[PDB]
Write a protein that binds this ligand. Sequence first.
Ligand SMILES: [K+]
Ligand SMILES: [K+]
Ligand SMILES: [Mg+2]
Ligand SMILES: [Mg+2]
Ligand SMILES: [Mg+2]
Ligand SMILES: [Mg+2]
Ligand SMILES: [Mg+2]
Ligand SMILES: [Mg+2]
Ligand SMILES: [Mg+2]
Ligand SMILES: [Mg+2]
Ligand SMILES: [Mg+2]
Ligand SMILES: [Mg+2]
Ligand SMILES: [Mg+2]
Ligand SMILES: [Mg+2]
Ligand SMILES: [Mg+2]
Ligand SMILES: [Mg+2]
Ligand SMILES: [Mg+2]
Ligand SMILES: [Mg+2]
Ligand SMILES: [Mg+2]
Ligand SMILES: [Mg+2]
Ligand SMILES: [Mg+2]
Ligand SMILES: [Mg+2]
Ligand SMILES: [Mg+2]
Ligand SMILES: [Mg+2]
Ligand SMILES: [Mg+2]
Ligand SMILES: [Mg+2]
Ligand SMILES: [Mg+2]
Ligand SMILES: [Mg+2]
Ligand SMILES: [Mg+2]
Lengths: 185, 177, 262, 206
Amino acid sequence: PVARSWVCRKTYVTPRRPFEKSRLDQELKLIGEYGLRNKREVWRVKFTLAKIRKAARELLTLDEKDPRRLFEGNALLRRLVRIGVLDEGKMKLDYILGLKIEDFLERRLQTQVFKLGLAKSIHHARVLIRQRHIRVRKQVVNIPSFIVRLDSQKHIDFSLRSPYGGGRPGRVKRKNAKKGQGGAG
Amino acid sequence: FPMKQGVLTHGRVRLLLSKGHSCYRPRRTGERKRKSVRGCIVDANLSVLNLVIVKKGEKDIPGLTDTTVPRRLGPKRASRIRKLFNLSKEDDVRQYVVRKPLNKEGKKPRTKAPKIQRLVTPRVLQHKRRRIALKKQRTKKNKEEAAEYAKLLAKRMKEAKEKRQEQIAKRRRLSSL
Amino acid sequence: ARGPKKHLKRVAAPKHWMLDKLTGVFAPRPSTGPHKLRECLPLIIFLRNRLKYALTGDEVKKICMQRFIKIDGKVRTDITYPAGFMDVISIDKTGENFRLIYDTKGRFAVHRITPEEAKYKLCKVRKIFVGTKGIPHLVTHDARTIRYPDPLIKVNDTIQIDLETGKITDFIKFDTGNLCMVTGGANLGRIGVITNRERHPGSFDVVHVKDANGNSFATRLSNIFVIGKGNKPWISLPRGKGIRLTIAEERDKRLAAKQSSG
Amino acid sequence: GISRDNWHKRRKTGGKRKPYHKKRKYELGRPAANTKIGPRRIHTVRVRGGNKKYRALRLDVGNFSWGSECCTRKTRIIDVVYNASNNELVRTKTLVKNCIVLIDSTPYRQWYESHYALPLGRKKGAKLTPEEEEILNKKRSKKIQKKYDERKKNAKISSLLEEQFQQGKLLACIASRPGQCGRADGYVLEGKELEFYLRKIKARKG
RNA sequence: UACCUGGUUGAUCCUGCCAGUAGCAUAUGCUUGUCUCAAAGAUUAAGCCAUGCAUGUCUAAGUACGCACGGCCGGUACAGUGAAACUGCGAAUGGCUCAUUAAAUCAGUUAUGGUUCCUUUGGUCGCUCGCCACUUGGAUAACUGUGGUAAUUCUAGAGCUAAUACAUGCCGACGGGCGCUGACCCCCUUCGCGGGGGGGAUGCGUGCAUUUAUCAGUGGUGACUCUAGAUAACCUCGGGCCGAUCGCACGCCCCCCGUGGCGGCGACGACCCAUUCGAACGUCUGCCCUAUCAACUUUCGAUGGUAGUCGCCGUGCCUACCAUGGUGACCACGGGUGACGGGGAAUCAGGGUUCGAUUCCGGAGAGGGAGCCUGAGAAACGGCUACCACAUCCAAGGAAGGCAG
RNA sequence: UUGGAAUGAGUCCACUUUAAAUCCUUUAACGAGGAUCCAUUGGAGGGCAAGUCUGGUGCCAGCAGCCGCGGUAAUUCCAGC
RNA sequence: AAAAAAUUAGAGUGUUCAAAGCAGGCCCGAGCCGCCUGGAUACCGCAGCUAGGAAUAAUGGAAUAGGACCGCGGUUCUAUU
RNA sequence: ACCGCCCGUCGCUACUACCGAUUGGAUGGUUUAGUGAGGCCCUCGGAUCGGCCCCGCCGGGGUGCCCUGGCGGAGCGCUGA
Ligand SMILES: [K+]
Ligand SMILES: [K+]
Ligand SMILES: [Mg+2]
Ligand SMILES: [Mg+2]
Ligand SMILES: [Mg+2]
Ligand SMILES: [Mg+2]
Ligand SMILES: [Mg+2]
Ligand SMILES: [Mg+2]
Ligand SMILES: [Mg+2]
Ligand SMILES: [Mg+2]
Ligand SMILES: [Mg+2]
Ligand SMILES: [Mg+2]
Ligand SMILES: [Mg+2]
Ligand SMILES: [Mg+2]
Ligand SMILES: [Mg+2]
Ligand SMILES: [Mg+2]
Ligand SMILES: [Mg+2]
Ligand SMILES: [Mg+2]
Ligand SMILES: [Mg+2]
Ligand SMILES: [Mg+2]
Ligand SMILES: [Mg+2]
Ligand SMILES: [Mg+2]
Ligand SMILES: [Mg+2]
Ligand SMILES: [Mg+2]
Ligand SMILES: [Mg+2]
Ligand SMILES: [Mg+2]
Ligand SMILES: [Mg+2]
Ligand SMILES: [Mg+2]
Ligand SMILES: [Mg+2]
């Protein structure tokens, strides 16, 4: 009766225990360094890491002669290498289990803009990205959680229409210049 | 409520009317409906009564018999035109069709004639010819296929019989020992 | 219900048609024709979804109403005509002459054949009986009753028929060693050579097929369609010659194609 | 209306079954023909699929077969004499399948003297008519007469069939379904089957 | 991520539950700037409904004499267009809802060698021996006019005219064959010759389908009482088939040039077969709670046998006669269910618990029952008839109804 | 204490979208300092993250899923911070 | 062997990211008939069907021999030759 | 912490369940018996609508030796719906 798809899922899993001091402190520390609006953001990456590490676990359970172990085992490693969390010399499933939370969210776009030197603070990173100042290859990306891949790390730079760059000035200074033109005469 | 022939009552009965019955036209195929109809016996409790003059007397009622209105349509079927003008079989029908003048204001006075149906025409002769022609191919088709299959059946049995006779000849000889 | 159904839901449609989900609620209900609803490809699917000749359903009928698409040499103008396996689709306006042959994974591929090959097709023998006044009759996988067949032809054999005369030219017996293509089940779309045919009385007889590369599989006798004599096929093989491959070999071929190109 | 459904019956265990749907059109039954003996009256029944069934309300004639001679001719049905189902079915002269009836013996006797040239159904008096004499005893030429002389070798029929022909009444069994096909066809009783039904009819009389 | 914490005591270790904790999905409270996707009168009332709408449909190709338009024309049967209306088909799908329903529905699985099937697609359609055919018969709408009624998608009388409506009915093929019957004729034997062997006048019959019986064994199956063949017939008047149909290109022959013959491409139609879409009934195995349900079914079919009837067929489906069975603690029978069944959803160590009205499939119902018409297909409800409940209009005579679209 | 940079929510040409529209995407204009363009909902004894701060009430009013708090200096009520 | 799709797991694919979708990608020069693809895969309990295994568990074969096996003598019947 | 703890009747208040004359009452389901709408089937029935037939007459040949175009009859019979 409708040509619609209802397929959807949650990208995060809430904590089993609501008020555990050590978990609260570690989540705050992470939000603080990688500049994240909320604790949901620490749980999204944690959920993705948990699914990936869980996926690696049954593969390690299967013997090396398993065809199923090889195919998605190789595919899983390739995806991790592509996004830049795993070194290309690290082709062992045993090495996925050593991944930590900060590894996955180190590849976030907002961290790269600050690191590459585009922004002078991790909180300045999100402002630049959300204000449409960063292109990846040729496309402006306004999502701070945009996962940069190795293929595109080298190409992050200012957008063409960004006043910070080869861009006509932003509206606030445009209003001062006309004040300057009016003030002069 | 209209009167219905054959009811045989001075009053109003309800009947399950179907197609072909009077006083009822179905809205879809196979539909029946119960409707109230009045019997065929004439009484005082009638609003209007229909009368059909079968015999005309010597007098003349104004309006009824003063003037005669014509039939609005001429015959269409070829036999109907022939019957009207008592034509024989070996006659032409096209010229003996009724042609109705058209005399509306503004448009010039044109004439219209009906399309005669059921008439031998060059097309009907051909269509009948094509029907006979298709009968030929089918008869020819049968003959050829039954002829061709006769050869193949004859050849296949020859191969089968020769092999059937060949091996029994082989078995008989080795059975001599 | 109170009678035959006239609609087909898009998700209930056969998955081999490769139809998507968000285009609409219904899929083209295969108008009745020689093949089965689940083992056919509607013309609108072939003309619109595969060849991209038309972008919408209304443009599909614009082609069909112009009397361009020919199936088995006959101009078919019904957009939901069930084309089916081993059928020739002729578009003389462009000289395409496609044939519908299952690919490896079990779908209908866009297999182009030469006009010389487009003059015939291969048909499995479904039923053999003598009708009317002793005249033999041969029924075919596409329900083409053919009168007066060669008496050597039996059930499960494959016959070659000319599209013009609609008459058998030559046939292939069903014996071990012939080349067959699976037309149903898990091994749908694979091409191989019969090696054995075990038979259960009052049960589906099982046949064993050996691939060109040595991949041995089995299926029911109903899904077996002989497509050649001994090793040689009688028809052009599809883009993949009925070789199943495995998800790993697909990745290797896919990766090799990408890196070789650049 | 009448239904031939299975869901109105008790289960094999004896438990009652609650219907999950009302009566369906395909489950319908129709009233019995109760075919009688009389002038041919047949009503056509439109059945499932648009086909036609011939309800024979009353039939007087029927195509019966003489199996031992392969002579099948249309003969009038005299009456019903026996019925295995109900003795009330014969009392009302009802024509159903596998009911024993009496049929006219003339068309079969006519074939018998036209084929074998022997008397059949004549007592000791043997009242003669020129028509039977012409077909029975006449000069037929040497080649054909011999062919008729060899028939006499195997022209003999059973005494039980002989008496039936003496009385002009032939016992026959209905083999068709008059209420379905509209035809009361059958075959003549001969041999062990015939003599079985005489015992039943004779036991009925007492 | 195979996990707990608080609470009985003066304190202790326990049992053990309460409480906490997390997901899920209904409701609600408060609050809410951007964007994408998106459930949504299931629960209670399968409760009731104002109004509007939800199913119609014409091609070159069934039927136009509506000037309603309109080319052509004093000259033509019908240019074309085209309403109305007849005919044809569809309206049995879709949509909705989950009330009923517990070996039922349904699921896997198997069967029809036990059936019915519009349509499509292929086959089949001179296979029959038998004074209009160069084409037959009545009608009847639409229309014209004359009406009735308080009132309806109400209808009546009168007049007119079509067919692929509704009927009726050849010709041809067509020379015959074959079956039987057989006047008769010849021949060979000629103990006398019976006999033995050939032609043959007349007469009857004859295809397919139907119904019965008999015979002998082309192709098929694991297995037919299959398929095909032959013989004797039959064949329903409420009537099997054997084209009185239509468009388009317009040719060809013509010796005995006739408005003589002959022909191409379509459509429409057709008994029957195969096929497709199915449907229907069966096989095996599987369902929740309950004994404060332990015996049940069998008058009035229960379980078998036989013969029928009916049906689309198999069958206690029904009837007659007969037997006395059949089911049960391996839970029958009975009751309950806030029970439609399944694919699936939530939760997740493993095992498992709970949910599944709901978009896909199957089923069921259309306020409640019941009975039907038409049709290939309905026990149909945006069909009908009756009753019951509810309800509308009325001039009180009547008329009309069905949102779980 | 400032300072001038940036931007999209917003308003709003066209353009695109689409059966026609819409939203989204783009664009021109405009549009941020209390950037008042002002984030809520629950809690702060323990379980359980967070005060034995201050005022009010005085086993009352209330709170409190549980244990418990309140009887005139309440870490728990009603409030401010 | 056969077991609907959707859903679930899972391969590929910058929906800009993402839930999603089944798309997309290369090559500008001629599209001369553009080419180059993908639209996988696994699980479907129980029952049924198929072919191996033969431990484990159940069951059976000779005890009034009514016994296995080998040939021998008869009394019969019936098709094909 | 024996000046502890604690049991039952009785009296007060509230709430829940039970027994209970009333042949109590209401609704749903199933069913015996009686009545039985309507459909369908059968046996009838025959309002009405046709045809043919027989004529009397101008009507033409059956090669009056009755092609018969028309009107009235009455066919006063048969036959169909
Ligand atoms: K406080
Ligand atoms: K009645
Ligand atoms: Mg006509
Ligand atoms: Mg269709
Ligand atoms: Mg079988
Ligand atoms: Mg546990
Ligand atoms: Mg305590
Ligand atoms: Mg204490
Ligand atoms: Mg709890
Ligand atoms: Mg907006
Ligand atoms: Mg439906
Ligand atoms: Mg029985
Ligand atoms: Mg009985
Ligand atoms: Mg329920
Ligand atoms: Mg449920
Ligand atoms: Mg459900
Ligand atoms: Mg409910
Ligand atoms: Mg449904
Ligand atoms: Mg229904
Ligand atoms: Mg209602
Ligand atoms: Mg109904
Ligand atoms: Mg409705
Ligand atoms: Mg409906
Ligand atoms: Mg509504
Ligand atoms: Mg707390
Ligand atoms: Mg704390
Ligand atoms: Mg105080
Ligand atoms: Mg997925
Ligand atoms: Mg004391």
